[PDB]
Amino acid sequence: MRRGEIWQVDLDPARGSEANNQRPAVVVSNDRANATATRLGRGVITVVPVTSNIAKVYPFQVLLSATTTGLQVDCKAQAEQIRSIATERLLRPIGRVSAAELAQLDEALKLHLDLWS
Amino acid sequence: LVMRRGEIWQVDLDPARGSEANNQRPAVVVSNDRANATATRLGRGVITVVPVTSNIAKVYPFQVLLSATTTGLQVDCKAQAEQIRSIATERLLRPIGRVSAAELAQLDEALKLHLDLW
Amino acid sequence: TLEDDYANAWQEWSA
């Protein structure tokens, strides 16, 4: 379990326009925290949900090509939907994002979370 | 709907699972004011926040202590960057206060560390 | 326009 891995996760129950249902998501917490998650067997890690709707890819979102990741179809990661989840919610590991996709996700996270300064 | 960054609001994180933050807890707005302003003009939207917990017994580097003196919190709480989460604005109950600028920058650094940002 | 992007990102279908 390391950063940039894509796992399937259970975001349910959810409310409003939040990411819902069982979705792929990208590990964005640093490998340090994730390592201690693995040591505890329980814990929280932070991930970015993915969505199928590729009609428009917004600046805070990053496009993942199913070729690169082992995803079933081309999807976009939504930094504006970022959220930390208990490791109970990790169902299965789908794949890994490319290093370029990861860099753009870092950059999208700075944009959405205002981490420029 | 008047959410802006660094503000402390009471929010309903429940239902929750595992070691996640639960119940109706204070939380700090960490999403950028463009999205938040857009939530206000819409009246609906999603924003990102960092929960705080009252259990300030031990504070980790990715956590920042917030002081009840100025923040409008009733007791000193610690913000947990590892509990970061995006929330529908249904979940906002009431506006508590604002974090100090020192606390805000320090949470920025805790978030950069936790998310491996640079 | 980035706020247009946000409004549409939230409202567009996810599931």
Numbering used by the authors:
A (entry chain A): 2 to 118
B (entry chain B): 0 to 117
C (entry chain C): 42 to 56
Excerpt from the publication:
Toxin-antitoxin (TA) systems in prokaryotes are modules composed of a toxin and an antitoxin. All the MazF members are RNases, responsible for the cleavage of all types of RNAs participating in translation. Consequently, the activation of MazF RNases often leads to the inhibition of the translation process, reduction in metabolic rates, and eventually the formation of “persister cells”. Here, we report cocrystal structures of M. tb MazF-mt1 and -mt9, two important MazF members responsible for specific mRNA and tRNA cleavages, respectively, in complexes with truncated forms of their cognate antitoxin peptides.
In terms of the MazEF-mt1 TA system, our previous studies demonstrated that while η1 (Asp59-Arg76) did not bind to the cognate toxin, α3 (Thr42-Gly58) bound with a stronger affinity even greater than that of the full-length antitoxin. η1 was a small helix that follows α3, and the binding of η1 necessitates the conformational opening of the swapped loops (β1–β2) covering the MazF-mt1 dimer interface. Except for the two residues Trp54Ser55, the overall conformation and interactions are maintained in the cocrystal structure, when compared to that of the full-length MazE-mt1 complex. The close-up of the interaction details revealed that the peptide complex is maintained by the interactions on residues Tyr47 and Glu53-Ser55 of the α3-peptide. However, the last three residues of the peptide failed to maintain the helical shape with Trp54 of the antitoxin swinging to the other side. Additionally, the knot structure of MazF-mt1 became open due to the binding of the antitoxin peptide. Due to the extra energy needed to pry open this interface, the affinity of the MazF-mt1/MazE-mt1 complex is lower than the MazF-mt1/MazE-mt1 (α3). Interestingly, we found that the 4-nt RNA ACCU occupies the site that α3 binds. The α3-helix poses severe clashes against the 4-nt RNA fragment, which is a putative substrate/product. The tetranucleotide was probably from the cleaved substrate (the recognition site of MazF-mt1 is CU/ACC with “/” as the cleavage site), and the structure mimics the product-bound stage after the reaction. Although we failed to prove this point directly in our subsequent RNA-cleavage experiment due to unknown reasons, the strong affinity of α3 toward MazF-mt1 and the structural coincidence with the RNA fragment both suggested that the α3-helix would prevent the binding of the potential RNA substrate as well.
